[PDB]
């Protein structure tokens, strides 16, 4: 059932084959540069984006 | 189908789980076109904000009564709730594409959603158009038909994955019709 | 002195005169709908955006 | 907000209600000023990315080998710095002065960039595009997105924020 708690799977895909490593970020096992992360998080309301859409919806963007 | 992240969906806190290295190599064998599929998922989530905002904006520009009084996204609260829902849906679709099936989308996003929207008066015609624009936008990214931003992938064909993710959007549309 | 710690003032401006309130967000005294928040945060590297700019810098956006 | 700048954890401070009313009596044009700050921070991502993108498209040698933003690591560091600078400028416009920008962002920065070989011409162009973009938003000359403000003139505040950007340009020249 849809639980009405706004929680959704947040998938993050990493490709660090260039060798640039950030401190503290090793969370799985591997050294080929690839990782997939999934968490389940409440998606929040964004008043700023809601204001912008209300104002700017009639403008075609991105060559759409 | 890829089930490694199932426990994230069901855990009390949704704390992140991670897979890399040889474990991830083995996982990718359980879904078709593993590497192009990760690129496709990355394209969705990396562009989540613009996908949602272009889709809701199009909903509104085609039917601007949606932002007039008694409209589905009249007031900033309602607009924000709609942008949030569009992102929630997009994210369950992204997880369907990662895992190669729609079971979690159907169970945790769609099951009960039509009746909730009916109770709240969330208009079906508007939901249908936001979904069809999100689908078109995602397919556009995956098939090298996005004009302001191109992906950084090796050049090739991703038409099968575009058809698969289109199917996941179609499940949303069908459930909310 | 610039401290080489990537920390910058993060300013956030709130106008909640429309009456929409989120639970647990009252952090100062005030009832006219306005608030300014400032924190000092390390500004992070964004690999995805770096990748996009590298690929897309020659695309004119936003009617510039 | 000075204690936020100097505290060890930089934990957030909040001003609303009467304190914010009072603060809006020590700076000019307090309401337009908060709309201007809001326009900067709400659009920080696209301001930064459009500005760094333009510095590259005008000089694409910057992403070639030996170039200032060759490799993702260096491009990401540059985008980060552009955002840092933009945010110090936003805080200058909130407070109506540049003391924190000069002390915590600009003092020692040119020396750091000289040591690293961060190119001054590229920095100059990124700053000039960031300035133009912010002024564009504040004066209704942005083309894709407009602000949700009462219509009116914000040219004085555009001049003031232009001066803060000019302090960055001058320091890094
Ligand atoms: C995420 C933003 C984005 C980037 C960056 C990029 O390169 N492409 C992007 C978005 C994108 N949008 C579409 C398709 C559509 N977008 C809209 C909404 C706008 N049309 C309006 O009339 C309007 C109000 C004035 C909008 C706002 C619509 C209607 C579509 C078409 C949907 C359909 O049924 O086909 C795409 C898809 C490729 C394309 O150009 O159509 C993309 C990639
Ligand atoms: C934050 C994104 C944005 C929205 C949304 C909007 O409505 N306007 C936005 C940005 C914006 N950009 C400028 C000005 C410039 N942008 C560039 C870089 C692009 N030009 C290129 O040639 C290039 C490579 C192909 C780009 C990338 C430049 C050079 C400018 C001009 C700077 C100058 O010296 O004047 C503005 C300002 C208003 C305008 O459209 O010119 C804005 C608001
Ligand atoms: C209703 C659902 C709205 C909506 C409102 C939200 N506000 C959020 C965060 C927030 N708002 C304020 C201003 C408020 N607090 C005060 O103390 C004062 C004046 C004394 C007022 C005007 C603040 C300071 C904050 C941040 C609180 C903190 O720093 O912990 C908010 C949360 C955003 C998030 O969780 O990321 C919401 C949802 N948002 C909407 O879209 C509708 C229109
Ligand atoms: C449609 C989705 C795209 C397109 C994508 C392609 N990707 C190709 C190969 C590929 N991508 C990766 C990175 C990916 N694998 C991972 O495990 C993760 C992170 C966890 C990532 C982000 C790899 C390793 C590879 C294989 C090496 C290679 O061939 O470079 C690819 C080539 C065909 C194939 O390998 O099946 C394509 C077509 N390309 C496009 O033009 C659209 C926009
Ligand atoms: C060098 C400065 C790069 C850069 C790297 C960053 N990566 C960030 C987060 C991050 N990276 C991974 C993948 C890594 N962890 C693993 O376990 C494995 C494979 C086994 C790899 C490939 C993960 C999982 C994460 C998130 C860590 C977590 O969830 O706690 C990161 C932080 C971004 C932030 O703090 O907001 C950085 C800076 N970023 C760049 O721009 C340059 C190119
Ligand atoms: C250039 C910046 C803009 C422009 C801005 C204008 N804003 C005007 C009035 C105004 N704005 C606010 C909200 C502001 N004050 C706050 O305390 C906060 C949050 C902390 C914010 C976001 C208020 C309260 C007001 C007074 C009117 C009202 O109650 O809404 C304004 C009218 C002139 C004036 O009052 O000085 C302007 C012109 N307008 C433009 O066209 C450019 C793009
Ligand atoms: C946007 C394209 C729509 C639109 C969306 C609105 N949804 C509103 C409230 C709402 N949405 C949900 C489902 C959401 N919560 C979840 O947990 C999940 C999945 C796990 C999803 C997809 C719920 C449960 C609710 C009510 C409770 C809540 O927000 O926590 C909403 C506000 C309606 C109102 O208050 O009248 C809107 C505006 N509205 C539109 O017009 C377009 C078509
Ligand atoms: C973008 C418009 C530039 C560009 C920027 C680069 N900066 C690089 C490293 C770097 N930047 C700083 C200053 C930064 N740190 C702070 O704490 C503050 C303010 C509080 C700021 C403004 C530092 C201290 C450093 C080195 C240490 C670190 O990153 O923590 C950088 C990497 C250069 C290299 O490693 O060779 C770049 C690429 N580069 C360009 O070409 C354009 C013009």
Numbering used by the authors:
A (entry chain A), C (entry chain J): 1 to 64
B (entry chain B): 1 to 177
D (entry chain D): 5 to 177
Sentences from the paper on this structure:
Cryptophyte algae have a unique phycobiliprotein light-harvesting antenna that fills a spectral gap in chlorophyll absorption from photosystems. We show that the cryptophyte Hemiselmis andersenii expresses an energetically complex antenna comprising three distinct spectrotypes of phycobiliprotein, each composed of two αβ protomers but with different quaternary structures arising from a diverse α subunit family. We report crystal structures of the major phycobiliprotein from each spectrotype. We propose that the macromolecular organization of the cryptophyte antenna consists of bulk open and open-braced forms that transfer excitations to photosystems via this bridging closed form phycobiliprotein.
Four new structures of HaPE555 were determined (resolutions: 1.57 Å, 1.67 Å, 1.73 Å and 1.95 Å). The largest peak of HaPE555 (555 A) is by far the most abundant PBP constituting approximately 63% of the overall protein complement (with other HaPE555 spectrotype peaks contributing 8%). All five crystal forms of protein HaPE555 are constructed from continuous filaments of PBPs, which are organized into two-dimensional rafts. The filaments are generated via knobs-into-holes packing but differ in the distances between adjacent molecules along the filament (having either tight or loose interfaces). This packing brings the chromophores of neighboring PBPs closer together increasing the possibility of energy transfer. The bulk antenna proteins, HaPE555 and HaPE560, are densely packed to form a concentrated glass of proteins as evidenced by electron micrographs and FRAP experiments. It is also possible that the rafts of HaPE555 filaments seen in all crystal forms are part of the organizing principle of the antenna architecture. We have shown that HaPE555 and HaPE560 form the bulk of the light harvesting antenna (roughly 6/7 of the PBPs) and capture the highest energy photons. Thus, HaPE555 and HaPE560 have evolved to capture photons that would be otherwise lost by the integral membrane photosystems: they plug a spectral hole.
